[PDB]
């Protein structure tokens, strides 16, 4: 017959990092195998159309990268500008809004993030730039964040007007199971906790270096793959030498053809392996990008009831920040802290009828009986407005005997 | 011509972009929605005034403004 | 021939211990669980609170508790018997090994 | 050639198994530690436990 | 102008099975191809890495 009910709460902010895209690479098939040689080029035509297939596969990967970025970041086509009055009921948003005093319109946290990720042409290998520059990504993120902060639950519906921030916070408090008066009576403490958590995240980013391992792994894997592809160009494969010019300048065509054939087979195998593994890695990255888009649309533009989908605890808000080849989310949650013991009962018997609470639980502190809500302690008198009646007092296991008050009799007496 | 310098482009209405050398397009400074993507934020489209192809920097959308109150 | 199979990091006993701890915590702590300062919450109150989340009032559970428990126990026993008889339940796990 | 074929097919199968494991983790966190309102995500009917 | 409303209920329990992991395998490349032979081992170095 015991129950524990929190008597306090704290505001918590955590982070989450998701890869979105990877580097775009184009390769010349003939230049890699038979770079600047006519005998090798004429021998290559006997093998059909391998080069076209490899080029097509790489091109499809390159297109899919830009599709991933476009799906993740360009969700809303309205551009919202930074509010000129930084009054949000005491909430500090300076460390995540764009810095007007810098040439690069990045926030402080984005600047910190973009300084923690670090970092062969004549072999036919080229890297070509992405369609959206970093400034455009930052602008999309900034517009999204500013619109979410200022327009509240209106946002994309148009005809937007500045909705006060505390009203949004109260409305999202209501979606957890806590009444608005808690926020409206603890606003200053809530804002203080929020600001402290943001500062703590900033310091943690400024000190620790291993935060972005998820984003570093992709770069490392791609670089290693390219390095292996380049190094496979010095192998012998059973010929007399690994240089086409040498064998062309030394031997006659009839046997040069045989040894050039050996070299050609080796180079073709290397290219095939590289392309296949790139295809598999691209599939994995696409799955990650789909997850990121779902996360953005379900956590930044609304409240989520799914457990642990937006960090630990009860979800309140989340804000996006851009990172190299990725995105960072900042989840804000509600965490009850201080628990106390009480005695509880399932029903109250008053005059031959059983009473159940409309919302919450019946709670006892030793002598009196009250009714509260589960997530915050706020006792009040048990009346006929808090409860409803069903049946008699002989079926419920564990019923009590006292006592329901009527808020009408004093009025009728007077 | 991808990743090339126009001064000098021996392999080659001439404009040097961040994506390479572009030949046959006229440069403007009015932003629009992307029609044919080139790369590095540059987009191209043909429209009326006949057979004229233009190159411009991409636009991210229509600006929106709200009245600020409390 | 150069082929070796090497063991997993977590033994089966550790997996079973994790599962048991998870189940016991869920059963005893109710909606508190991971928040700490855990105290035994009565199970029937958890069942009533989850009945409320479907669209049914608590009095239904508090007036049909015994029948509900009987049905639950019968269903658990039926699952046990079905596992004890049928052999093709775990084809999903058998396919990977094959 | 034999070794190459074996390794490639193992890689693909590993990707599939990883997707299944992600589904299992989501199922655990959304059905064992809370109630789910998603239809047919936790069996047929209205989910209780 | 008709509607149907239940007058009873039943409790149902079902099962669901999900794979999580598979077997871990390590292979020696040279021992598979050129097991205990020096001529084969020296010929293998011509193929790179
Ligand atoms: C629910 O949980 C909240 C959250 O913790 C708690 O209520 C507040 O708890 C905080 C600490 O957790 C209290 O803060 C401390 O208050 C002490 C007394 O406050 C007086 O002195 C400060 C001095 O600046 C005045 O500003 C204030 O107006 C009061 O006159 C202070 O001694 C503490 O300050 C010292 O430590 C801080 C660092 O923590 C230093 O920066 C200071 O310089 C100084 O050295 C500290 O400020 C706070 O008073 C509590 N009440 C509030 C915010 O109203 C409880 O745990 C709980 N509340 C419940 C159950 O009601
Ligand atoms: C919540 O919002 C408020 C405004 O509403 C912010 O307050 C200002 O924040 C800025 C940015 O941090 C502060 O500017 C800083 O000034 C420092 C020098 O002055 C401070 O320190 C001296 C003591 O040396 C004090 O006497 C003085 O009063 C100030 O307190 C600079 O040194 C800082 O630059 C350093 O940090 C930045 C971090 O970005 C580095 O990039 C620099 O290279 C350098 O190392 C900085 O410019 C300003 O002082 C704050 N105002 C007040 C009144 O304190 C809060 O920062 C904001 N908080 C959060 C968590 O969002
Ligand atoms: C919660 O509240 C309810 C109602 O307020 C309580 O239920 C009553 O409990 C009292 C005891 O505290 C019961 O009183 C006793 O009833 C005995 C049975 O007689 C009644 O029941 C029969 C059933 O066949 C009827 O036919 C008959 O007409 C009566 O209505 C009596 O025999 C008892 O009398 C004896 O003991 C008393 C003790 O003082 C002596 O003075 C007498 O001389 C005699 O020796 C006694 O009167 C009462 O019947 C209960 N009501 C009902 C409706 O069941 C719960 O007990 C209470 N629970 C808690 C935990 O507080
Ligand atoms: C709900 O919870 C209750 C306890 O709160 C459980 O009740 C006991 O369960 C155990 C386990 O099944 C029972 O132990 C069994 O005893 C059998 C022998 O005694 C029974 O049978 C004779 C008739 O032969 C009766 O006279 C006697 O009263 C008992 O009913 C053993 O033979 C059993 O072992 C066999 O089954 C097990 C299954 O695990 C096999 O592993 C064995 O190899 C062997 O084949 C078993 O040990 C105990 O009897 C139950 N108590 C009572 C009072 O009946 C319920 O089982 C539990 N139900 C569910 C669905 O969870
Ligand atoms: C809503 O749905 C429920 C769920 O089915 C139903 O209400 C119950 O319905 C079941 C039948 O499905 C009833 O079970 C049967 O009850 C008969 C009468 O019960 C008396 O006899 C038993 C004998 O043990 C006593 O224990 C009991 O207390 C009563 O005095 C019994 O004859 C049946 O027992 C026979 O079959 C079982 C196997 O089913 C054997 O184990 C027995 O040994 C015996 O051979 C059986 O117990 C149950 O009684 C109903 N309960 C209630 C509260 O209604 C209805 O369909 C529906 N209820 C509504 C609308 O109110
Ligand atoms: C919850 O806390 C209360 C204290 O408020 C505990 O009450 C104690 O109960 C033990 C016996 O169980 C007594 O010996 C103590 O004197 C009680 N303390 C007080 C201050 O009254 C209660 O036990 C706790 N809950 C549980 C389930 O143990
Ligand atoms: C805790 O229980 C005590 C009784 O032991 C309550 O004290 C009385 O409460 C009533 C109404 O709440 C007041 O009218 C009395 O004046 C109180 N008496 C004393 C001596 O203070 C107390 O209210 C209970 N508190 C909670 C939060 O349940
Ligand atoms: C490619 O062209 C660019 C022009 O955008 C060159 O960059 C400048 O080139 C001029 C002369 O061509 C130099 O005086 C400047 O110092 C260069 N600026 C920078 C920042 O380097 C670039 O040098 C050309 N590259 C090659 C290989 O010719
Ligand atoms: C839009 O482009 C025109 C080019 O036709 C710009 O006109 C030139 O601008 C540069 C500096 O940006 C000057 O050095 C030239 O002398 C200008 N040429 C002429 C003929 O005026 C024009 O300035 C651009 N618009 C803006 C707002 O920068
Ligand atoms: C919302 O609309 C009301 C009117 O419907 C605006 O009230 C205007 O306020 C300005 C001063 O700020 C006055 O000059 C106008 O005369 C008012 N309009 C009317 C019809 O009286 C209100 O300003 C609008 N909201 C915001 C945030 O601007
Ligand atoms: C808005 O109203 C609040 C009081 O509700 C006041 O403190 C604040 O100064 C006002 N700001 C503006 C810009 O009107």
Can you tag this structure with a few keywords?
part of a larger assembly; 5 chains; 414 residues; alpha+beta; four-stranded antiparallel beta sheet; three-stranded antiparallel beta sheet; 43% helix; binds 2-acetamido-2-deoxy-beta-D-glucopyranose; Spike glycoprotein (chain B); viral protein; Glycoprotein; trimer; Spike glycoprotein
Summarize the structure.
It is classed as viral protein. This is part of a larger assembly, with 5 copies of chain A. With 414 residues, chain A is of the alpha+beta class.
List the helices and strands and how they pair.
The structure is cut from a larger assembly and holds five copies of chain A.
Chain A: E1 2-6, E2 9-19, E3 25-27, H1 29-34, H2 38-44, H3 50-73, E4 78-80, H4 108-113, E5 125-127, H5 134-151, H6 165-174, H7 180-207, H8 213-231, H9 244-250, H10 253-300, E6 314-323, E7 326-336, E8 339-345, E9 348-349, E10 354-357, E11 361-364, E12 369-372, E13 387-389, H11 409-413
Antiparallel strand pairs in A: 1-8, 2-7, 3-5, 6-7, 8-11, 9-10, 10-13, 11-12
Helix pairs in contact in A: 2-10, 3-10, 6-7, 8-10
The complex binds a molecule of 5 linked components (NAG-NAG-BMA-MAN-MAN) (5 copies), a molecule of 2 linked components (NAG-NAG) (5 copies) and 2-acetamido-2-deoxy-beta-D-glucopyranose (NAG).
Glycosylation sites (chain B): 5, 29, 48, 70
Protein name (chain B): Spike glycoprotein
Family (chain B): Belongs to the betacoronaviruses spike protein family.
């Amino acid at each position: 017959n015991s129950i524990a009910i929190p008597t306090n709460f704290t505001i918590s902010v955590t982070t989450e990092i998701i890869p979105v895209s990877m580097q775009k690479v184009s390769v010349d098939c003939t230049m890699y195998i038979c770079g600047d040689s006519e005998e090798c080029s004429n021998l290559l035509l006997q093998y059909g159309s391998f080069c076209t297939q490899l080029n097509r596969a790489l091109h499809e990967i390159a297109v899919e990268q830009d599709k991933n970025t476009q799906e993740v970041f360009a969700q809303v086509k309205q551009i919202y500008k930074t509010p000129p009055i930084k009054d949000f009921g005491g909430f500090n948003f300076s460390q995540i809004l764009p810095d007007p005093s810098k040439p690069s319109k990045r926030s402080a946290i984005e600047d910190l993030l973009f300084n923690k990720v670090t970092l062969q042409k004549f072999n036919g290998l080229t890297v070509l730039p992405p369609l959206l520059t970093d400034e455009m990504i930052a602008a999309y993120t900034s517009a999204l964040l500013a619109g979410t902060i200022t327009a509240g639950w209106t946002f994309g519906a148009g005809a937007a007007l500045q909705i006060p921030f505390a009203m949004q916070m109260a409305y999202r408090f209501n979606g957890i199971g806590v009444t608005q008066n808690v926020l409206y009576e603890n606003q200053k403490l809530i804002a203080n906790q929020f600001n402290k958590a943001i500062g703590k995240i900033q310091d943690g980013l400024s000190s620790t270096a291993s935060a972005l391992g998820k984003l570093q792994d992709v770069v490392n894997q791609n670089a290693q793959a390219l390095n292996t592809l380049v190094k496979q160009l010095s192998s012998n494969f059973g010929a007399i030498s690994s240089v086409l010019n040498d064998i062309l300048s030394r031997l006659d065509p009839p046997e040069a053809e045989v040894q050039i054939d050996r070299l050609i087979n080796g180079r073709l195998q290397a290219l095939n392996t590289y392309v296949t593994q790139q295809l598999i890695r691209a599939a994995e990255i696409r799955a990650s990008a789909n997850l990121a888009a779902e996360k953005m649309s379900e956590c930044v533009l609304g409240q989520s009831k799914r457990v642990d989908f937006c960090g630990k605890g009860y979800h309140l808000m989340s804000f996006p920040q851009s990172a190299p080849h990725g995105v960072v989310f900042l989840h804000v949650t509600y965490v009850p802290t201080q628990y106390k013991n009480f005695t509880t009962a399932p029903a109250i018997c008053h005059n031959g009828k059983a009473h159940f609470p409309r919302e919450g639980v019946f709670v006892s502190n030793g002598t009196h009986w009250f009714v509260t809500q589960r997530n915050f302690y706020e006792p009040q008198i048990i009346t006929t407005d808090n409860t409803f009646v069903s049946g008699d007092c002989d079926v419920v296991i564990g019923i009590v005997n006292n006592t329901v008050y009527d808020p009408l009799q004093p009025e009728l007496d007077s | 011509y991808q990743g090339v310098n126009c001064t000098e482009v021996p392999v080659a209405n001439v404009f040097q972009t961040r994506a390479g050398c572009l030949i046959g397009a006229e440069h403007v400074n009015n932003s629009y929605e992307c029609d044919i993507p080139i790369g590095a934020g540059i987009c191209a489209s043909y429209q009326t005034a006949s057979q004229s192809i233009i190159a411009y920097t991409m636009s991210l959308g229509e600006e929106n403004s709200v009245a600020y109150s409390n």
